[PDB]
Amino acid sequence: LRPISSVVFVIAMQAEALPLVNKFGLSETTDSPLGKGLPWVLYHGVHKDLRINVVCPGRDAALGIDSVGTVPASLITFASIQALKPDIIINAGTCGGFKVKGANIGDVFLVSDVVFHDRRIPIPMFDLYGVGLRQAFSTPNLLKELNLKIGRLSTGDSLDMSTQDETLIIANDATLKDMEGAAVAYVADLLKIPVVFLKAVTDLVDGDKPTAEEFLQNLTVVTAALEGTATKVINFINGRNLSDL
Amino acid sequence: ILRPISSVVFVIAMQAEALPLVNKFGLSETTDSPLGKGLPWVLYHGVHKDLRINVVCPGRDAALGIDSVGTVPASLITFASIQALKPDIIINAGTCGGFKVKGANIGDVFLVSDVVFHDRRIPIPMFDLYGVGLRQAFSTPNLLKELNLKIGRLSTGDSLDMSTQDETLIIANDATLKDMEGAAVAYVADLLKIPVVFLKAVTDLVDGDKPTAEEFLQNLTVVTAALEGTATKVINFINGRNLSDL
Ligand SMILES: CSC[C@H]1O[C@@H](n2ccc3c(N)ncnc32)[C@H](O)[C@@H]1O
Numbered sequence: 001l002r003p004i005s006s007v008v009f010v011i012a013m014q015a016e017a018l019p020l021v022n023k024f025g026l027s028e029t030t031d032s033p034l035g036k037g038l039p040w041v042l043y044h045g046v047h048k049d050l051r052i053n054v055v056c057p058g059r060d061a062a063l064g065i066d067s068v069g070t071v072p073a074s075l076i077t078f079a080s081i082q083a084l085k086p087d088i089i090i091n092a093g094t095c096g097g098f099k100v101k102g103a104n105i106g107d108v109f110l111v112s113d114v115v116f117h118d119r120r121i122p123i124p125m126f127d128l129y130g131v132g133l134r135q136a137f138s139t140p141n142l143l144k145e146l147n148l149k150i151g152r153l154s155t156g157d158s159l160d161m162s163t164q165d166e167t168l169i170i171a172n173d174a175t176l177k178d179m180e181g182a183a184v185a186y187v188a189d190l191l192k193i194p195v196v197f198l199k200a201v202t203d204l205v206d207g208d209k210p211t212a213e214e215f216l217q218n219l220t221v222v223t224a225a226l227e228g229t230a231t232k233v234i235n236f237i238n239g240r241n242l243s244d245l
Numbered sequence: 246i247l248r249p250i251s252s253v254v255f256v257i258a259m260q261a262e263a264l265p266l267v268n269k270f271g272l273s274e275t276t277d278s279p280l281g282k283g284l285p286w287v288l289y290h291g292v293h294k295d296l297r298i299n300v301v302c303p304g305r306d307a308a309l310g311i312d313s314v315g316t317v318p319a320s321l322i323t324f325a326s327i328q329a330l331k332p333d334i335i336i337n338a339g340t341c342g343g344f345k346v347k348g349a350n351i352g353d354v355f356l357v358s359d360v361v362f363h364d365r366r367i368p369i370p371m372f373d374l375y376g377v378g379l380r381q382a383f384s385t386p387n388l389l390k391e392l393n394l395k396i397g398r399l400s401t402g403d404s405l406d407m408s409t410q411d412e413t414l415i416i417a418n419d420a421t422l423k424d425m426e427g428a429a430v431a432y433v434a435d436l437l438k439i440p441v442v443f444l445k446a447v448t449d450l451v452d453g454d455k456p457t458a459e460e461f462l463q464n465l466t467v468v469t470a471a472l473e474g475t476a477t478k479v480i481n482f483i484n485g486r487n488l489s490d491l
């Protein structure tokens with residue numbers, strides 16, 4: 001194949017995006033290419049062989065906080081692909097992890113495949129549609145060379161975990177829990193773009209700390225770990241085609 | 246505004262909800278991918294007197310072959326429809342759950358007052374309210390007076406069934422109706438500043454018993470005629486009006 005020339009990072013919270021924006025001295029896009037009047041934020045730059053763009057759903061017009069979850073993440077994935085036609089999408093962010101699955105706080109995981117835990121449609125074949133099992137782009141050399149942990153990602157639009165959520169997450173044998181990944185995959189799949197995930201563990205879903213409190217306390221230190229790893233992924237991707245990883 | 250409405254987009258999640266209306270207005274499936282090439286999305290186009298009518302459906306899932314229901318495809322088709330087709334107003338029309346205790350009956354077509362989510366639980370300050378996603382449908386008082394549709398709040402989530410956690414939030418948010426797309430369509434309509442309204446036809450009573458096969462089939466023809474007929478009368482009413490008039 002031809003060498004990868006353009007990467008787009010999809011990142012749900014600006015705080016998680018910014019250390020990576022610094023590292024590569026990307027600059028904030030000023031011309032609203034994805035749509036006038038949208039709250040979306042885009043940073044762009046060029047690094048050795050690669051165009052680097054990073055897109056965030058930005059702050060909610062009315063409530064002023066990051067617009068997390070499946071819908072905005074899906075919209076910015078769609079709009080950034082149509083506008084920039086990248087070779088690869090990278091969905092990078094924080095997540096819950098399971099101790100029992102070997103997750104530890106600060107671990108930055110590669111994702112093998114992804115599902116949803118909150119799309120329950122008890123009609124045959126709609127049930128499978130709602131789970132939405134999709135494989136990440138095969139990156140074995142990146143996996144091997146960066147020495148990343150890998151596991152299944154389970155997505156839903158809640159930060160806590162209901163009984164039914166827990167039932168499906170366990171049944172799907174997920175290691176990791178988030179609010180955007182499976183939706184990013186859905187759009188990447190829809191538009192035929194290779195997708196890879198970097199999910200940095202901020203809290204242990206099966207541990208003894210409350211989720212909300214642990215996620216918030218560990219956000220800054222884990223974001224920094226995420227930046228470190230994203231930086232190495234960008235450097236590894238540079239000059240490769242998709243077969244090389 | 247006061248400019249007369251020239252263009253209406255219908256966002257309809259399942260093709261079985263869309264095809265009766267499509268046939269009623271003799272809309273044609275477009276040949277030339279107006280929303281982007283190589284996608285499973287379906288666009289039906291026609292004109293009915295003063296009005297351009299677009300009906301858009303997320304279509305068949307490429308892996309499982311069934312209708313691409315739920316908030317993600319709905320949000321994506323709405324976004325792309327707004328950008329490509331530049332409508333004056335969006336109508337999200339389809340079937341839903343209803344609460345008999347909020348006055349819903351099978352076959353009722355509701356005009357929706359406002360929309361929320363029930364499955365975006367984010368229990369941290371100000372993200373919690375964001376997860377609620379409370380938005381108002383476009384004010385249409387004349388259409389309501391004319392058509393005498395029941396009205397109520399719609400609660401959206403990605404599951405057809407109802408967990409106890411869901412029920413709790415649905416009750417807390419005081420919803421009459423339950424679906425899997427509405428609040429996601431509204432979110433996008435709001436982002437792009439397009440008036441949005443909702444026609445929601447009650448197919449099942451979330452707080453009533455299972456119908457027999459006989460009932461379910463007979464109810465279905467009723468729900469189908471009710472949705473189609475109500476959407477027809479809505480198009481006819483909009484024609485010749487500006488947004489201020491409804
Ligand atoms: C403020 S909502 C939580 C944000 O961080 C991620 N996150 C990390 C913790 C975690 C968890 N335990 N469950 C679900 N999402 C989580 C989500 O994908 C979302 O962008």
Ligand SMILES: CSC[C@H]1O[C@@H](n2ccc3c(N)ncnc32)[C@H](O)[C@@H]1O
Nearest residue numbers: 258314340341342405423424425426
């Ligand atoms: C095949 S999933 C059901 C579809 O019909 C709608 N619908 C029907 C009733 C119903 C319900 N009781 N709960 C949630 N969505 C429902 C949804 O918005 C979705 O497009």
